[PDB]
Structures are given as C-alpha cells and as structure tokens.
C-alpha cells in the first residue's frame, strides 16, 4: 500500500502552488540550474503542487527505502497539540499529530519540532534540521529579544504572539516561568505562520515568536521584516511516525546518511540559505 504522507504549508520547507490547467505542475529550475522536484498534494479536496526542503527530503527517503507515497495537506492546518475532550477525560491531538495517530497519515514530513510532549505518543526520526526559536518584527520595531520589557511586561500596546496549536504554543504554556507571556500570547495567537507574518507586515502584529529556519528565510526575502538575530531556544525538526512503525530505523539512518554525505547541505543551500 502507498504511504500516506501528511504535511503543512510552511515555506521554504513546503511550498503549495496551484496545478496547471491539465492537473500537472509547472516545470521549474532553481536559479543555479537544478530541477525543482514537485509532487501532487491534495488539500482543502483539490489537488495542488507541493515542493521545497521537506519534499526534496521525502523524495530522497522514498527512493532510498523503496516506498511509494501520496501527499496531502493537514486538514485543520495545524502542526499538533494535545487538547482535552470537552465533558470527557480523554485527550486528543489536533493538527498533523492527530492525523498520524488516527491513521489518516502514516508519516509526517514537515518542519515538525521534536519535543517531549509529542515523543510520548509518536516516534521521531533523528533531526533532519537543527534550528531554534527567534522573534520576527517589522523593520522599525526595536526590542532586545526574548528578555524584553515589552515582552516580559506585556500590554495591549505591543502585541506579540505565535501560531496556535504548535510547538511554540506548547513551549510557553508548560513553563510556569512564561505564564505572564503566555497569557498575552493566547489572546493573539494566529492560525498560521503566513497569517502571522503578514500581520507583522500590516503592523497589526508587533512580534512573532516562531521557528528560526522559517523566520530567517522570511527576513531574507521580505526586507521590510527582520528577526532579532538571537536564538533563545534550540530545537530540531524530525520525521513523525507511529509507535513501532516498520520504517523508523531506516528513516533515521537515511537522514543521518544525508547529513554526512552533503545532501542536507545541498537542501540548505537550495531552500534555506
């Protein structure tokens, strides 16, 4: 059977573009002459074309371990947090985490942050990308970083947030030392990284706490934005699989091999740097 890959729109790791009229993907090459590999990804019911860092990784993994796949975008648009089921005892995961645990997906191929919360229930590959958390602002906003009076002593005058139901949302709620910041953040968190980044571009949002490999790419493309340049917490992205999946070991070995032979270096130069 074909492996059901779930992913999420998150440039430069996953680009999502409309198909052409005949349902195929427009042929493209990088500025350096490399063919841009594109796969069909269904999403919210309509086929689309997906490519980028993680899609390149998915193709390498499929050919290395000899498996076929079908890609779909996460139905609710979230990465995945655990929520209480109302008037019940059970907890359930949303986002890509829920789809992986439901069976709607066999493997998560996305910038999925490894943390203790998710590792209790799923198996993570070895990290295919090392990065961390940083802050994105609009050019003209001046803050020191994570330990700013405007962030440590929040008010409705300086609005900062992150993405709902994400690793960063988990990080700020579990820590009692971040309770004041999280209270400000929970009333402003955005549904998507793109909506939050554009909100910083519309000056509605003043700071955006998110993944460094995404925010730094956003600054290099939209010079009206800028990051702190500081990493206040470091984390890695990993492939997500169900417990005792038959592919766990060879996915991790494949990723380690890709770091060591320069394949990930090529992905970084193509998509991130």
């Amino acid at each position: 059977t074909r492996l059901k890959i779930v992913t999420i729109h998150q440039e430069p790791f996953v680009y999502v573009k409309p198909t052409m009229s005949d349902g195929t993907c427009k042929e493209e090459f990088t500025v350096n002459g490399d063919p841009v590999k594109k796969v069909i990804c269904t999403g919210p019911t309509v086929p689309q074309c997906c490519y980028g860092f993680c899609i390149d990784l998915l193709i390498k993994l499929a050919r290395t371990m000899n498996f076929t796949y079908e890609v779909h975008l996460v139905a609710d648009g979230k990465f995945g947090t655990q929520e209480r089921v109302n008037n019940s005892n059970k907890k359930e995961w949303n986002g890509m985490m829920g789809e992986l645990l439901s069976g709607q997906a066999d493997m998560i191929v996305a910038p999925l942050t490894i943390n203790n919360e998710r590792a209790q229930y799923i198996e993570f590959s070895k990290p295919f990308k090392y990065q961390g958390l940083t802050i994105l602002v609009k050019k003209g906003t001046r803050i020191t970083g994570i330990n700013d009076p405007r962030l440590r002593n929040p008010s409705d005058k300086f609005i900062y947030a992150t993405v709902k139901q994400s690793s960063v949302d988990i990080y700020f709620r579990r820590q009692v030392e971040l309770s004041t910041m999280y209270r400000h953040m929970e009333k402003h968190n955005y549904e998507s990284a793109a909506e939050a980044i554009q909100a910083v571009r519309d000056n509605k949002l003043h700071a955006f706490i998110w993944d460094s490999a995404v925010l730094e790419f956003e600054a290099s493309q939209k010079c009206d934005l800028v990051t702190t340049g500081e990493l206040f917490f470091r984390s890695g992205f990993g492939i997500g699989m169900r417990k005792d999946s038959p592919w766990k070991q060879n996915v991790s070995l494949s990723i380690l091999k890709s770091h060591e032979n320069g394949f990930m270096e090529d992905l970084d130069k193509t998509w991130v740097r």
Partner: protein
C-alpha cells in the same frame, strides 16, 4: 536489573577526569567515581583498576538521567581507542564497549553517525555538533563547503587550513571533498591545542573540527581572537548522543528524559555551567 555498566571517555569540558581527593581518598562533591584500567607496561594485558573521579557537562547529564530514569551505575573510562572506530570491522572505543556488551551505555562527547547507528541505538541528541570552522577574527569564510576550501588554489594566497587527522572529521572530508582532503593534509594538526596556537600565531588560517569543541574553545579564548562560523553553516549537522545496546529497553525513557531536560531549561543551565564562555562572536 537497575545497575548499569557505563563507559565514558575523557574530553573536557564534557568529561573531566581527576584523581581521588588524597585526604579523604574518596571522590569529592561535584564529581562521581570512575575507574580506569591502567596497564603495567605496553608489553602485557596485565593492569590495575585505578579509582579516579569524573565530572563535566555529560557527567551532569548522567546524574540527571540516573535520578530521573532511576538507575545506578558503575562508570569506567575506555582504554582501547577513543570514541569509536571500526578497525578491520572490529569496533574499539566507547562504541566497542557497547557493541560487545561490556557496557550498556556510553556517556560522553559521542557523535551520532550512521555507521555507529547500525550497531548501537543512539538517544536523541543532547547537544548539537558537526563540522565547523574556526578562524582568527577578521577572516571571511562561510563553512566547510566554501569554495576557498573546496578549490584552495583558485585563490592567491591559498588558505592554510587543516584538521586533526585520523578522526571523524578527516574521514568525512575525505569522502565528500577529495581534493580538499588531499590539500589540507599538509596542515594536519597534532591536536586541538596545537591548532589554536597555530591559528593565534599566524601559522594557520582555519581549523576544521567538531563544532561543539570549537564553540567551547572560541567562547573562552583569551582576547577572544578566535571565532567560529554561524550555527547555520555547520556542515553535516548532528549531535552528541547517549549510545545504548541495540534494542535497549532504556532508550525510550532516556529519550523522554533528555527531551524533558531540553524543554524545561535544565539543559540550558548545564550549557551555562559548562559550555558558555566570555566571548560571543
């Protein structure tokens, strides 16, 4: 059982080895007991187990893991090899102690790679590392894949750069950048300390080595003259990990404990305690 044979390897600041306190003849606080098998001479397997005292970044990890995962251990230093090398398909070092079941756990500056992962299970990485570059302040280079390293003779004068041979760094460059390896062997360094002196005295332009080791040295370098590239340009990013026997029943809880230490601030405190220096690029 909850008692575990655990092997380690001296490499400051991750594992630091001291003698027992002469007055009490026990291991003082901050340190844990470790035993080293010390040979009588180079012409015998005869030797004596000597009591020593170990401390450092990864020793503090071991204490946290033993407290959190609830196990006790006998810690001992590896004596044949260092981290782990496959010599004629036979492992030495800490990896050898794990694969051949003399230890159930290896704690130290042990780099995760594919070759070792086929014979041992690795925990989640607890610190990041890889191939990084150290230069004197003012030198402009991107990383291992810089054309100034790949094609050294495209520039006049060519960069004087090298590594400490016979380790994972040389093996990686040999496979990925054959000409760069051929070129840089003329600048082989006998050790890390030699390379720093060669950098600070103008005899060498770049030192290519373990990122975690280079970041530590740059953080405490005097005058802060030596700097490393940014973390985004580290080549073949990986990390130090706890090695366990294949199919170890300790791997899951050790993974969860390490990820807990990362998320709850315990890991950053150990980095502040052992790894962060005065200098900040």
């Amino acid at each position: 059982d909850n008692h575990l044979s655990i092997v380690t390897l001296e490499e400051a600041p991750f594992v630091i080895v001291e003698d027992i306190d002469p007055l009490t003849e026990t291991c003082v606080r901050n340190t844990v007991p470790c035993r080293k098998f010390v040979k009588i001479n180079n012409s015998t397997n005869e030797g004596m187990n000597v009591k020593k005292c170990c401390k450092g970044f990864c020793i503090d990890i071991l204490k946290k893991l033993s407290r959190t995962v609830k196990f006790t251990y006998d810690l001992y230093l590896v004596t044949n090899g260092k981290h782990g090398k496959k010599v004629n398909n036979v492992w030495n070092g800490m990896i050898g102690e794990v694969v051949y079941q003399r230890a159930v756990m290896a704690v130290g500056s042990l780099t995760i790679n594919e070759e070792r992962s086929e014979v041992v299970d690795f925990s989640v990485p607890f610190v990041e590392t890889g191939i990084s570059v150290m230069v004197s302040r003012g030198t402009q280079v991107t990383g291992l894949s810089d054309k100034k390293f790949q094609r050294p003779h495209d520039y006049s004068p060519p960069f004087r750069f090298g590594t400490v041979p016979n380790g994972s760094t040389e093996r990686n460059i040999r496979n990925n950048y054959p000409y760069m390896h051929q070129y840089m062997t003329r600048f082989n360094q006998r050790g890390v300390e030699d390379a720093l002196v060669s950098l600070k005295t103008g005899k060498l332009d770049a030192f290519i080595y373990d990122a975690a080791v280079l970041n530590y040295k740059a953080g405490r370098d005097e005058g802060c003259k030596l700097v490393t590239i940014g973390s985004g340009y580290i080549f073949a990013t990986t990390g130090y990990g706890i090695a366990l026997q294949k199919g170890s029943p300790w791997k899951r809880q050790i993974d969860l404990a390490l990820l807990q230490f990362v998320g709850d601030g315990e890991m950053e405190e150990l980095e502040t305690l052992w790894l962060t220096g005065i200098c900040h690029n």
